[PDB]
């Protein structure tokens, strides 16, 4: 019915002819009394036809309905906080002192906020309604609102329109105060290390690179927190942690964005067992916390469900391998015999013989693959049995890794080896310690059935 | 006296034979049964416990011995230490000659103990071994400047203060996120790498993302993001977290430092000062049970002065008090050809630097800060109504031409608080940012936080380096 710049245009308009004579029309300030959901919570109980013109409260909210009878009777729906209410605006309940009725209601579109000073009451057919005196318009919105990627380019769009949308970054923050309370309670003590750093250590990831002017200096984007964390252990805080963003400059997909959300922490005394073990109780306990249960549905068409009853299961890389293929692969895993035995390098074919045969093994349970190589895990100890292999765990759901973790190689002479200031505190006493990372948004998405990370995050990264 | 390297390389040698020997030197797992803490409490009440045989972890701070059959450490875990007295008798020998054992464990060692709690006949709180085990050694000498930025474990186990300074960080944070949270506010987490980098007047960061081919600079607030989530309808956002300024370094100032944003639909600039008021005096309550703190502005070699945190604090406009203190009516526009310059007069007259280029919001930023912004030493306190042209996402002030519902809170000197109520007409104001206004950003008041700095008054500290763990510093 509408052209949107026209009416964008006129918008426009009206809030310079409101200004030309005198209106405000951006007000600095309505004292509000009651929000939506006090004022639900505080009138569900009326009857169906029951006015409390005696009452009159301050209300504010934005309109995303708008209805009328006629002119002398409007229709709002008038959202806070998630919550919904009935504006019923009559002519004759009007302060008309203060405007004109048509006048007033008439430049009230879908999409402004609002201040209402009225009267709770409710409709014949039970309609919990404010009955304005008055209704300001606090701020316009310029755009028709709707009734693709707009959801990730104007997030606040998506936030006012879909529950749901809402409902995953509710979820999302619990997730995260829900870890940071598991912590604080077992006496992990918080702390933010540097993101920019000469060297850019922790993980095997291409970093982002960035320059500092009055120094000039060039300086990496953390693309993980491990090794300032250990160095805090050697500094003597036993129990240690960090959740934050981390950095990594490669491609963007479902399951990958530019900056996520990690946790990791250090547990000085503790080993891979222990690891095993608190990982078993945050995954099961996060959530019952948020369901009641152990069991969510998770849509991977029809939903799977995954059981997060511990324990999990247990699979050892070089052993499952083998079992699978009937094949040994001798612990010199980078030398010639063994690695064309499975066929650049010997991590890659192992990343890949895993990430065939092994990380798609259970997807009713999150379930741990153990034990991996040293050649693949430079900074994890190695096995206190098993040659060439170090006690490293990782876990997975539906596919994906949300947990890496293993027994911290503190010995700082095995480690020049897998290749400073790091490589200094080492020489300073790193006690046995255990380290675990977690990737929060790949967490948030099983726990709010989203198939794309970009779904998890507010701004996920995008082009223009 | 020995020399460094030498330790170094005996202690390495000592290793190997550790390894040669069969025996492992960094062992994977010491089942311990208390922390030093736990212990200090479950014992604080000459006498032993010779049935009770405990497991505990920590690390060798002093070595001493009255001869070879009676030896004195300190061991300490999570800030607090005990004493170790290993006793010839109380051996078991079984595990190892006495004398080669205890020879063996130097100053910096991690150490698992096996034994039973007691006091010494002077007193001391100590754990009696049966067994000691080296589960780390430390390779270099410990000492008894520049080292505690670059090796901050160092510090940690060497300063009780500097481990106190960070305990009182978090400390600090912890309130600040429960404050909102008790209040209604919702955490989010914003974009660190945006297309624009809007938020605050300085300079960023850039970085280069590879497969989009995409330039992308590191956000110097958070801002205009944690605005567009006020209009998608979350009433009460914040945001912990770094923010990115490319430019110099001192006291006061690191290329990363911690903010906290938060953003409030529905209020303005007096509830922004209200909050301020209670935010700041709950916080030094709840460290130190008193609202007045004292602080070494000059140095820890001067004498300190007392912070009072108790409200209402002053608020000083920053116009009536410029026009005040230099005797001159500032007409608008500020600029204006005619009051730029007599704010370059007013500046050569009291023989201060002028800006980097004269603007006129550089020029009133230097007369408030020359003027203003040390009237209060003794009090934390409050610049309000900042003009227009200082101010660009701040609205205009209700009934004051020219001027904003603009606060910023200073302690000695230095500013830890900025806020305002928000600029919501897209007329009289990022492309992403610019669009959402017009989409109807409701009235909202808005405050940022200097967490760093804000530590520093609250931990005594000088420099911002102090209390960030690891500051940026040259290689
Ligand atoms: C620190 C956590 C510990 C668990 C494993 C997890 C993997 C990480 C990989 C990754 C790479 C990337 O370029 C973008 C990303 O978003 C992600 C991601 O979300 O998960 O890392
Ligand atoms: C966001 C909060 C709102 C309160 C006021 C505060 C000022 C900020 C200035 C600054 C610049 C810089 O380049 C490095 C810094 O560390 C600091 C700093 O610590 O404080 O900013
Ligand atoms: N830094 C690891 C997580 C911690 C593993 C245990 N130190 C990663 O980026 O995946
Ligand atoms: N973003 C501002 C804080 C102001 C808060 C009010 N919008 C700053 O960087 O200083
Ligand atoms: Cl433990
Ligand atoms: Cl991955
Ligand atoms: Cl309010
Ligand atoms: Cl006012």
Redesign the pocket.
């Known amino acids: 019915e509408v052209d949107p710049r026209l009416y964008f245009e006129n918008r426009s308009k009206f809030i310079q002819d409101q200004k030309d004579k005198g209106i405000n029309p951006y007000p600095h300030k309505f004292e509000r009394t009651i929000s939506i959901p006090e004022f639900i919570e505080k009138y569900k109980d009326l009857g169906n036809g029951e006015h409390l013109e005696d009452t009159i409260l301050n209300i504010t909210g934005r309109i995303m309905r708008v209805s009328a009878s006629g002119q002398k009777l409007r229709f709002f729906d008038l959202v806070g906080d998630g919550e919904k209410i009935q504006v019923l605006a009559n002519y004759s309940f009007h302060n008309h002192e203060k405007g004109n009725f048509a006048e007033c209601y008439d430049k009230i579109r879908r999409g402004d906020i609002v201040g209402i000073v009225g009267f709770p009451g409710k409709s014949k057919k039970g309609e919990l309604s404010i009955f304005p005196k008055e209704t300001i318009l606090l701020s316009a919105c310029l755009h028709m609102l709707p009734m693709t990627e707009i959801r990730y380019r104007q997030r606040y769009l998506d936030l006012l329109i879909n529950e749901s949308s809402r409902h995953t970054f509710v979820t999302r923050t619990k997730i995260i105060n829900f870890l940071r309370n598991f912590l604080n309670e077992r006496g992990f003590f918080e702390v933010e290390t540097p993101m920019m750093n000469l060297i850019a250590g922790?993980?095997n990831?291409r970093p982002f690179i960035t320059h500092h002017n009055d120094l000039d200096l060039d300086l990496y984007l953390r693309?993980?927190?491990?090794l300032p964390l250990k160095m805090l252990i050697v500094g003597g805080i036993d129990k240690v942690y960090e959740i934050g963003k981390?950095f990594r400059n490669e491609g963007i997909d479902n399951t990958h964005n530019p900056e996520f959300t990690?946790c990791?922490f250090?547990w000085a005394y503790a080993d891979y067992n222990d690891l095993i073990k608190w990982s078993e109780d945050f995954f099961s306990q996060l959530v019952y916390h948020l369901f009641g249960t152990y069991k969510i549905s998770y849509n991977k068409n029809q939903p799977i469900e995954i059981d997060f009853t511990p324990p999990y299961p247990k699979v050892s890389i070089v052993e499952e391998i083998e079992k699978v293929t009937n094949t040994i692969l001798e612990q010199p895993f980078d030398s010639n015999e063994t690695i064309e035995k499975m066929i650049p390098t010997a991590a890659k074919l192992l990343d890949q013989l895993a990430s065939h045969f092994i990380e798609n093994k259970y997807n009713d349970k999150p379930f741990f693959i153990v034990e991996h190589p040293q050649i693949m895990s430079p900074?994890?100890k190695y096995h206190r049995t098993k040659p060439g292999l170090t006690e490293?765990l990782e876990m997975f759901i539906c596919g994906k890794e949300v947990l890496?973790?293993?027994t911290?190689l503190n010995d700082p002479f095995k480690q020049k080896e897998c290749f400073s200031a790091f490589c200094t505190s080492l020489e300073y006493g790193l006690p046995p310690t255990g380290?675990?990372?977690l990737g929060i948004d790949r967490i948030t998405m099983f726990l709010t059935n989203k198939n794309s990370i970009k779904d998890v995050i507010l701004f996920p990264t995008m082009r223009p």
Do not use: P, W
């Not at 693309?223 to 491990?226: H, L, S, V, W």
């Open positions: 922790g993980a990831a693309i993980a927190t491990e981390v990690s990791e250090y900074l994890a490293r890496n973790a293993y911290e380290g675990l990372g």
